[PDB]
Design a protein around this nucleic acid. Structure first.
Ligand SMILES: [Mg+2]
Ligand SMILES: [Mg+2]
Ligand SMILES: [Mg+2]
Ligand SMILES: [Mg+2]
Ligand SMILES: [Mg+2]
Ligand SMILES: [Mg+2]
Ligand SMILES: [Mg+2]
Ligand SMILES: [Mg+2]
Ligand SMILES: [Mg+2]
Ligand SMILES: [Mg+2]
Ligand SMILES: [Mg+2]
Ligand SMILES: [Mg+2]
Lengths: 96, 116, 204, 203, 99
RNA sequence: CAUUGUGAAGAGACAUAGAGGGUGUAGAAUAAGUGGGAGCUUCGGCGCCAGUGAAAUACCACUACCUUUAUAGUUUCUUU
RNA sequence: UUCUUUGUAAAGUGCCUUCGAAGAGUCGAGUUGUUUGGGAAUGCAGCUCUAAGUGGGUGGUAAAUUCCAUCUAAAGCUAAA
RNA sequence: UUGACCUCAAAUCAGGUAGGAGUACCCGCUGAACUUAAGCAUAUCAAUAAGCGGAGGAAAAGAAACCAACCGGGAUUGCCUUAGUAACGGCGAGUGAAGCGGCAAAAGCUCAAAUUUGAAAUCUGGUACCUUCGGUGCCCGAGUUGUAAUUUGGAGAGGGCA
């Protein structure tokens, strides 16, 4: 009851898990026949956890000249010097 | 809850409740909701009224037409005794009453100082 | 703002028991401590005339001295060995030029009674020699204050009604904001009485 | 309901009405015994909040305990040890005055079970508490499945084992990183991390 | 508030399609209800003020809200509670003037 | 500090009105002030363009500092 | 396998609207002592002070300001490893 | 005068319950010193031994006022690991956890705070009967200073429609 959903993929995976569980199980009526059904011992082993495939193993090289290291360095720099830049912008704004 | 819903026509509050904080808010609540209240002697009397031992409070919320006029002429005096005197009893501190020997002592000192 | 024009609109004309020069001062209250850093300052911008009786010992003696005659009041040259010790007494403002930079000899024995010494309070060695003469000669205190405060200059003469003392007030009465701290109040020109010699007393 | 008004009014402890009423009740409680049975709870809202129900088998006792520190019971202050243990006066008891109050009440009434306790009054010398007790032999508690868990033998002297609210508070039983020493039991965790775990095939 | 896609920076993390889940009711524990507002106001009228609240009232009247907040922070625990107590005392003062 | 409440007074202190007087020098006066410039006035007294002195002097427009005192709100102590 | 029909009872589910009560000598703060790996103070306890309700607690460097995240204390029960 | 109510008593009153033992393990309180530091006082030994109180077959804890800072997880407990690490420490001697991850086992919930108000619907006890770990009828009593039903924040409640 205490976890929330922020990820549509995880939510859809769990919903698909529930759908296939409801298809795979049979519920006996509360009163009568009890239709003997040859139990299995591990719902976890009948519904294994699958790691999602993230990408395909072969693609085309999409290079456009940013080197992927200048990017990291610039992100670190603007995070480091964010608040100083807003302070400068504020004092420039309240400069009359 | 009846007072909060303004369904009460007349409230009687017993005066000898041993935690007085069970009923100290009831007069102010009745004055705020505009329902008339009366502080009455005897939670035991209210208990015999409602077939209990004590009741500590009672309320008429809807009366029959045979004595609604009696209710009106009664409440016209009850509200004059309590509700209209509420904003002046709210300011007056009771108590501070000395014993018999101390009262005689202080008034003896008074008629000692009354030399003129 | 002090006055859109409220309570001070035409009540300097119907009190004309004295049509003579009616110069009313502006005094109001704010204390400060013992230092002499940032007290009474502030030559402001205020366009009314003063029709004063002042004198200017303006020092420059090229034949523009009688151009200083139409710019100012009197001309002084630097013959200073025995000119003055006890003369300069009736004055609103003074002014000098390119000659009076190194006149220390004529300086402490006479410029100490009223203390008009050329320190950072009295910048008379002036090159700018035609704009701060007829309009700025008006009453505006550039003095040094007491242990508490000095605020006094006339806002208007009796012949000048206050159609201009609605553009003078808050070009002027943002007074000590450009240097001082806010130990003072926010525009502490408050309770005022306009009274030159015959004007009545009105209160906020 | 009036219980909301009472709970809001009980928080105005320095209002003139509550301080006058408190000043009367503290004298009335000094004049009685140190432990005495109250006929009905002084704060019914607080009692029924903590679990009291006005039915047969619920008992309210009132108890006063002496305030202040625990003087170390040693003759003439001589502790016979290193100077770090020479403290006698300003040492503080690790359980609360509320806890020892309800323990003394539980010793007085051993046939009852302590449910909760609550502060009613105090002065410079004493603190005053009202202890809620429940009789685990009355049939109204043997039945009435909402409360018959107290009839279990594991609930004898909950206040002596520190299982009441103030007992768990003073044991430090709370979730969080601030309670890593005392979360499942202080001595339990100490044993758990001072034991030596040796396997058959030594890792 | 969407992520950048890389491992550092201002909004680092993997870009995933969000959901905005349903709001929990326990996130509204401190919300004031009509009944509770009514009860608290009535109890305040019939109970009055405490001694430190009265000295806060006269401190606000005489020596200003800065010293009032200082005394309230010394009396209560925190500066936040001092500010809240001082502003509700200001509202009390305004209501007493309007009364 | 709490236990610890109820009253009277007195002393303050902080707020609120009013009140008076103050050094050398010398102008025209025991001169602590202000920007201004000569006027309202029973005086033509006082100031003015006049002398001169650290300062202009009617005048405060606001008090530079008091307590030497009075009315009411707050609190800090003392006595009972 | 059999008898009683529980039950004009109870429970669940969709949409709209009005609401939505939630624990105080407690939380928190100061100080003292003890304790902790807890370090401008981890927990506990004594004394003093003592709350709020878009609030409160926590976010491992004290404090102010602006945000954000995460739960909902001061009441309680519960097998197995 | 009579009858209540509240509070407090007394009974070899009716019916019950507590003590004490054991204590390996468990929950607390209290609480050292020898020792090590090549001395010794903080420290360490040790939040240990002794002392005291209280339970069960397990106890305790437990369904977040949690961990986190991530694409977030999700009661408690225990094991492997984190880790002899972050940190504490005459920063000396020494001491020293926790989150994540894998696994064992898995289980969730309920009161207070609402007017039943067109009906205290609730319950102990006594007594008669019966199919007796209890049930039905009757009679006192408890209880409105609140026993039942309804709801527990994950929600939920009151109306309206299907
Ligand atoms: Mg003691
Ligand atoms: Mg100890
Ligand atoms: Mg500590
Ligand atoms: Mg438990
Ligand atoms: Mg010893
Ligand atoms: Mg040994
Ligand atoms: Mg040694
Ligand atoms: Mg040795
Ligand atoms: Mg030795
Ligand atoms: Mg032992
Ligand atoms: Mg258990
Ligand atoms: Mg250790």
């Amino acid at each position: 009851h205490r976890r929330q959903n922020r990820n549509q993929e995880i939510f859809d995976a769990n919903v698909q898990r529930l759908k296939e569980y409801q298809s795979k199980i049979i519920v006996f009526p509360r009163n009568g026949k009890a239709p003997e059904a040859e139990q299995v011992l591990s719902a976890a082993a009948t519904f294994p956890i699958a790691q999602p495939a993230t990408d395909v193993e072969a693609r085309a090289v999409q290079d456009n000249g940013e080197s992927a290291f200048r990017t990291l360095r610039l992100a670190r720099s603007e995070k480091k010097f964010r608040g100083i830049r807003e302070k400068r912008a504020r004092e420039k704004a309240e400069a009359e | 809850a009846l007072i909060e819903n303004k369904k009460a026509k007349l409230v009687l509050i017993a005066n000898d409740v041993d935690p007085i904080e069970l009923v100290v808010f009831l007069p102010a609540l009745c004055k705020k909701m505009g329902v008339p209240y009366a502080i009455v002697k005897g939670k035991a009397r209210l208990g015999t009224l409602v077939n209990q031992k004590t009741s500590a409070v009672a309320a008429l919320t809807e009366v029959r037409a045979e004595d609604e006029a009696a209710l009106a002429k009664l409440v016209s005096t009850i509200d004059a005794n309590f509700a209209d005197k509420y904003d002046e009893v709210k300011k007056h501190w009771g108590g501070g009453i000395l014993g018999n020997k101390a009262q005689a002592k202080m008034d003896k000192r008074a008629k000692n100082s009354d030399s003129a | 703002v002090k006055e859109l024009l409220k309570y001070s609109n035409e009540t300097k004309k119907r009190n004309f028991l004295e049509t003579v020069e009616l110069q009313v001062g502006l005094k109001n209250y704010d204390p400060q401590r013992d230092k002499r850093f940032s007290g009474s300052l502030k030559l402001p911008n205020c366009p009314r005339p003063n029709m004063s009786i002042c004198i200017f010992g303006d020092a420059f003696d090229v034949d523009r001295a009688k151009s200083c005659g139409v710019d100012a009041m009197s001309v002084d040259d630097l013959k200073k060995l025995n000119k003055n010790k006890k003369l300069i007494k009736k004055l609103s403002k003074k002014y000098n030029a390119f000659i009076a930079s190194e006149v220390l000899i004529k300086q402490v024995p006479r410029l100490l009674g009223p203390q008009l010494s050329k320190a950072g309070k009295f910048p008379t060695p002036v090159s700018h020699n035609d704009d701060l003469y007829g309009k700025v000669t008006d009453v505006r205190s550039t003095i040094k204050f007491q242990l508490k405060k000095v605020l006094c200059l006339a806002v208007a003469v009796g012949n000048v009604e206050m159609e201009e003392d609605v553009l003078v007030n808050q070009i002027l009465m943002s007074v000590n904001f450009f240097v001082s701290l806010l130990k003072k109040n926010w525009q502490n020109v408050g309770s005022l009485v306009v009274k030159s010699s015959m004007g009545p007393a009105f209160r906020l | 309901g009036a219980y909301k008004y009472l709970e809001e009014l009980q928080r105005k402890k320095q209002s003139d009405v509550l301080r006058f009423l408190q000043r009367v009740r503290v004298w009335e409680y000094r004049q009685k015994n140190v432990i005495h049975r109250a006929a009905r709870p002084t704060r019914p809202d607080k009692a029924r909040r903590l679990g009291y129900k006005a039915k047969q088998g619920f008992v309210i006792y009132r108890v006063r305990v002496r305030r202040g520190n625990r003087k170390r019971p040693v003759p003439k202050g001589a502790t016979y040890g290193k100077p770090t243990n020479q403290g006698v006066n300003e040492l503080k008891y690790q359980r609360s005055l509320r806890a020892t109050a309800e323990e003394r009440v539980g010793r007085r009434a051993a046939n009852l079970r302590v449910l909760n306790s609550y502060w009613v009054n105090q002065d410079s010398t004493y603190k005053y508490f009202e202890v809620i007790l429940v009789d685990p032999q009355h049939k109204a508690i043997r039945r009435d499945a909402r409360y018959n868990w107290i009839c279990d033998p594991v609930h004898k002297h909950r206040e002596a084992r520190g299982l009441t609210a103030t007992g768990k508070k003073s044991r430090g039983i709370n979730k969080g990183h601030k309670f890593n020493n005392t979360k499942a039991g202080r001595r339990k965790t100490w044993k758990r991390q001072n034991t030596l775990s040796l396997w058959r095939y030594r890792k | 508030t969407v992520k950048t896609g890389i491992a550092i920076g201002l909004n680092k993390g993997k870009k995933v399609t969000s959901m905005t889940p349903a709001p929990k009711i326990s996130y509204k524990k401190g919300a004031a209800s009509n009944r509770t507002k009514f009860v608290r106001s009535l109890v305040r009228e019939i109970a009055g003020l405490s001694p430190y609240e009265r000295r806060l009232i006269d401190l606000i009247r005489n020596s200003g809200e800065k010293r009032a907040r200082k005394v309230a922070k010394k009396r209560l625990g925190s500066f936040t509670r001092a500010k809240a107590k001082v502003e509700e005392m200001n509202n009390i003062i305004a209501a007493s003037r309007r009364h």
